Design a protein around this nucleic acid. Structure first.
Lengths: 36, 156, 59, 168, 298, 141
RNA sequence: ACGUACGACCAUACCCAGUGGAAAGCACGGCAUCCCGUCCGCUCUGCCCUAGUUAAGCCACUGAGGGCCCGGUUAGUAGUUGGGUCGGGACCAGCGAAUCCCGGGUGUUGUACGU
RNA sequence: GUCCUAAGGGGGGCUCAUGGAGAACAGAAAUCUCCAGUAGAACAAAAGGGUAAAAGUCCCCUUGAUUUUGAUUUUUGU
RNA sequence: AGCGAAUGAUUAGGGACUCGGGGGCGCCUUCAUCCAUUCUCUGUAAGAAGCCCUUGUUACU
């Protein structure tokens, strides 16, 4: 019985919707920060 | 008669079957005439639902439920239930009295039928009933449906 | 399974009742043309040493 | 032992009339207790149904009133004057309380009203020492010490000293 | 002949908490007081602990940690003698003054003392501190939650006097007006004048006026120190107003308690002098041998 | 766990995502329990809420493992010291390696298992050996 | 070190008896006008800190007390994992308890303000 | 054919079953008072688990016993 | 899952009994009715995707 593989960046599906909503906007903000 | 049934049948030395039969008979008499009770006696008999006998429990719960629909004021505030307490708080439930008969000046659901007719008139404009308007059978069916919907809303 | 009714008397009868029953049933056996009805449900179980002494006294 | 906060005092006096039946008799007994104590009495229902007593549960069968302060001493003095300042030794409890009973309330000095009738009473005097707030308060409630608890003998001597009574 | 307290009862006995056996802590309320939302993480939840003693009032800022509670700031009612109030340190006005002093101390310690100044003249109106117009932006007021302990929260309690003191000092304590000593349940309207009277201690003043008019002996028995230090019923309002002004001026005044004064080491030495000590193992064995000899003689 | 009051430091532990925690179901409080299985199991926090945390466990089914995400209240979870021996080791090894690089002398960087003991001298002064028979002579008496 | 407030472990802290308590702090206490709640100012709430008292709470000490806790032993014993072309349980390689008994104890500690 | 398939939420106050000792009628059993009382009561599992300033009981207001969308467990939809 | 002083018995001696039933001459009775009595308690971790410092983004706090 081999241990299943895991992903480096897991899917934010079961996470708190408020924290996910803030986190996506934070990702967009740092995205334009890196584009600048 | 109810006091004698309570004393002879529903007592501490009485058997469970005797108590259940007495409480069932008391429940039947209370369905036929509810004003026979005293409030203290009715609360005492409703307290028999905590009995370990299933028959005594179900007989006492039947008596309590009967007085829940009929006359919830005698029942204790713990025993009234949801709809009884809401009705007594809002004021719709009225005390039952000897010889009191219904004296409705208007038909049941006539206000709801008039409200539906006014809503239809308002919709037509956007696009008293018993005294003047003729009672159509379709209008009577709509009034019955509105009364059923209002009863369901009051139950909810 | 353990139960209290294993250790109780299952059939009891009094002195006068047993004596009257035995006397009546004996009077019924006196007549050979009279037979019982439902005899399977009737308590019919109730109805139905010189050498040793000499050997004891002298072996 | 002689410390002035170890002196015995009356915590309360409770007057009880158990009529055994509801209605006008209990109402007039409550009237008697109200006019005697000056306070509104409280009713007591039966807690279980007894067939041989003719009572049932939730039916009001008794009335009582609790009086404290010098009014309790005055009422106790009147009751003891009725009981001729004489008690039997069983009447004192092991916890330091005592009590007695009268058969006619007109012996207390109350007038005879023919509509009211005649009712007897149970007097129960509960004693205390200063420092019972330790066991009665809400925050930091504790227990009274064994040296501070009242003894039956101490209650008997206090009764014989104050009310010059005869315990026998 | 039942013996309820036997060895089986003592072995199956499970004690309560120590501070509940002492009757000092209500853990059911304390849990709801000290739980912070886990998505808010290490954000402290400041509580105004208020406790009332026969001769003192204890008001504190308390934070909760996993191994104990920390006192951020503390103000006591006996420290009002340095501000002027040397009479009636357990009444409603002294509770208000202690709450105001605690609020000023905690705001000075935080550094928001000038940004958050509450209502400077006490009016008796139901107000809560709101966001201040900071030059940087909007600064939310400092928040603390009231902890009355095992006090019955009736209308007119001084646990709400300390609450009003902190609310006038500048702490955002969420609160309602229905437990202030001017509220009528039937009308559901607060009486601002009666509340201000309780703020400035006018109920005590009219009590001394009524006693001086009717029962002079009871007045002299109760309000004896008021007579001795010559403070009147009409001067209480000015005394409490001057005390509030001095509290807002210098929140960290030091008061000499007039008690005997030594150092920590000196008090330690004195307490060790007045301290009976446990017997040693040798002494306990010697007295056990003496008891054994007494039993052998018996 | 005794009956009565729940200790209050259960509510004062701060929980973050990625932490390793175990599930000890408290019988007193019924709200927020996991299933009967997933009791005594250890997992990773993936979601933290106001009064509960989300734990990733790996259940086994047939010949494979399935990831499970469970929402368990803070009253039933406890910090796990499984990675305490890793965090203390990484901090100690980091500072020790920094000190060793500063000093110049290399040190042991990996934990070593139980090696056999080296040679030493045991003196019989005041510790003279006693001779033992297969059965004790006092026992034979 | 001794108190007070909030506490962490939650009987080494509990229960039953006695003995003592400098300083302050506690507590009992005194009064029912106002706020408030009661059959009863008992509890709660308001006012007093003046008087009285350590009587009780509380603290400390004592007990061949009950209970609880911690060590030795019990014991390399019971039990358990592998081996033999071992006997009709014992050896080999190893892991490894708790009772019963013998004793000890009878609370540590954080923050803040004081004595 | 009649009857039963169970009132939830918030806040506050108080302890239950039972035992001992006492009070005219009153006693085995009516009401009242004190002390002891780790749950031996109650909560709709008759000897399961859990609860004592409560999850029990009483009092005051109330129907979160309400709409909407995903996630997880028991395991395509439920 | 089932059992349960929530059980299984005893009732001779005491009553109430009376139309409960029945008999004899409205009256007594003979059984019988009951009641009064009593007995029985295996998960996770052992790193380069890890650790530390600095720095932003946010509508979350």
């Amino acid at each position: 019985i081999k241990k299943p593989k895991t992903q480096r960046y897991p899917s934010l599906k079961g996470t708190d919707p408020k924290f996910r909503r803030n986190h996506r906007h934070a990702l967009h903000g740092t995205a334009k920060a890196l584009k600048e | 008669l109810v006091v004698k049934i309570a004393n002879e049948f529903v007592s501490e030395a009485s058997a469970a079957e005797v108590a259940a039969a007495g409480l069932n008979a008391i429940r039947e008499v209370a369905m036929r005439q509810p004003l026979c009770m005293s409030e203290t006696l009715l609360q005492d008999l409703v307290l028999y639902q905590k009995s370990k006998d299933k028959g005594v429990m179900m007989a006492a719960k039947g008596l309590q439920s009967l007085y829940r629909e009929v006359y919830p004021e005698m029942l204790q505030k713990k025993f009234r239930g949801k709809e009884a307490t809401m009705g007594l708080r809002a004021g719709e439930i009225k005390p039952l009295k000897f010889g009191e008969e219904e004296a409705a000046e208007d038909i049941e659901g006539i206000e709801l039928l008039e409200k539906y007719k006014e809503e239809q008139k308002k919709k037509k404009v956007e696009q008293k009933l018993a005294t003047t308007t003729i009672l159509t059978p379709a209008d009577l069916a709509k009034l019955k449906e509105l009364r059923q919907q209002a009863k369901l809303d009051k139950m909810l | 399974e353990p139960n209290r009714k294993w250790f109780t008397n299952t059939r009891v009868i009094s002195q006068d009742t047993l004596q009257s029953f035995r006397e009546a049933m004996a009077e019924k056996q006196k007549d050979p043309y009279t037979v019982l009805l439902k005899s399977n449900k009737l308590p019919m179980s109730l109805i139905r040493h010189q050498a040793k002494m000499t050997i004891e006294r002298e072996p | 032992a002689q410390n002035p906060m170890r002196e015995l005092r009356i915590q309360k006096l409770v007057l009880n009339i158990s009529v055994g039946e509801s209605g006008d008799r209990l109402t007039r007994a409550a009237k008697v207790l109200e006019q005697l104590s000056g306070q509104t009495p409280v009713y007591s229902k039966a807690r279980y149904t007894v067939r041989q007593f003719g009572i049932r549960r939730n039916e009001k069968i008794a009335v009582h009133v609790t009086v404290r302060g010098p009014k309790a001493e005055e009422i106790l003095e009147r009751g003891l004057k009725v009981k001729e300042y004489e008690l039997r030794r069983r009447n004192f409890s092991e916890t330091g309380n005592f009590g007695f009973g009268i058969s006619e309330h007109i012996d207390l000095g109350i007038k005879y009203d023919p509509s009211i009738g005649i009712y007897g009473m149970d007097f129960y005097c509960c004693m205390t020492r200063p420092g019972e707030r330790v066991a009665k308060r809400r925050r930091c409630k504790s227990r009274i010490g064994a040296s501070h608890r009242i003894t039956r003998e101490e209650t008997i001597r206090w009764f014989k000293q104050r009310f010059d009574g005869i315990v026998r | 002949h039942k013996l309820v307290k036997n060895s089986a009862y003592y072995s199956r006995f499970q004690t309560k908490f120590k501070r509940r056996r002492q009757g000092k802590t209500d853990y059911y309320a304390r849990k709801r007081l000290i739980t912070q939302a886990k998505n808010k993480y290490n954000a402290p939840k400041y509580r105004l602990v208020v406790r009332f003693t026969n001769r003192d009032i204890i008001t504190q800022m308390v934070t909760s940690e996993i191994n104990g509670d920390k006192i951020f700031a503390a103000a006591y009612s006996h420290e009002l003698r340095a501000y002027g109030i040397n009479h009636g340190l357990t009444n409603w006005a002294a509770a208000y003054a202690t709450g105001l002093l605690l609020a000023r101390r905690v705001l000075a310690k935080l550094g928001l003392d000038k940004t958050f100044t509450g209502v400077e003249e006490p009016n008796g109106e139901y107000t809560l501190t709101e966001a201040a117009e900071t030059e940087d932006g909007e600064r939310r007021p400092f928040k603390a939650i009231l902890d009355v302990g095992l006090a019955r929260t009736s209308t007119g309690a001084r646990v709400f006097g300390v609450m009003k003191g902190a609310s006038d000092g500048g702490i955002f304590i969420p609160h309602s007006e229905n437990r202030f000593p001017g509220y009528d349940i039937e009308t559901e309207e607060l009486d601002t004048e009666v509340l201000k009277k309780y703020i400035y201690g006018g109920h005590v003043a009219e009590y001394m006026e009524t006693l001086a008019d009717d029962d002079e002996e009871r007045y002299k028995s109760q309000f004896v120190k008021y007579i001795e230090d010559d403070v009147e019923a009409d001067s209480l309002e000015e005394l409490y107003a001057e005390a509030h002004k001095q509290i807002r001026a210098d929140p960290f005044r030091k008061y000499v308690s007039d008690a005997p004064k030594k150092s920590k080491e000196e008090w330690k030495a004195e307490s060790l002098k007045y301290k009976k000590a446990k017997l040693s193992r040798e002494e306990r064995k010697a007295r056990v041998e003496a008891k054994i000899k007494q039993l052998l003689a018996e | 766990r005794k009956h009565g009051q729940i200790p209050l430091s259960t509510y004062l532990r701060t929980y973050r995502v990625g932490d390793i925690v175990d599930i000890k179901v408290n019988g007193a409080v019924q709200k927020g329990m996991p299933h009967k299985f997933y009791h005594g199991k250890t997992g990773v926090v993936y979601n933290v809420t106001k009064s509960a945390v989300g734990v990733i466990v790996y259940k086994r089914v047939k010949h494979r493992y399935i990831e499970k995400r469970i929402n368990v209240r803070i009253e039933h979870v406890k910090p796990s010291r499984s990675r305490e021996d890793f965090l203390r080791r990484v901090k100690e090894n980091a500072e020790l390696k920094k000190k060793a690089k500063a000093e110049g002398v290399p040190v042991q960087l990996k934990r070593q298992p139980a090696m056999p003991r080296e040679a030493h001298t045991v003196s019989i002064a005041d510790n003279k050996p006693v001779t033992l028979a297969p059965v004790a002579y006092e026992t034979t008496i």
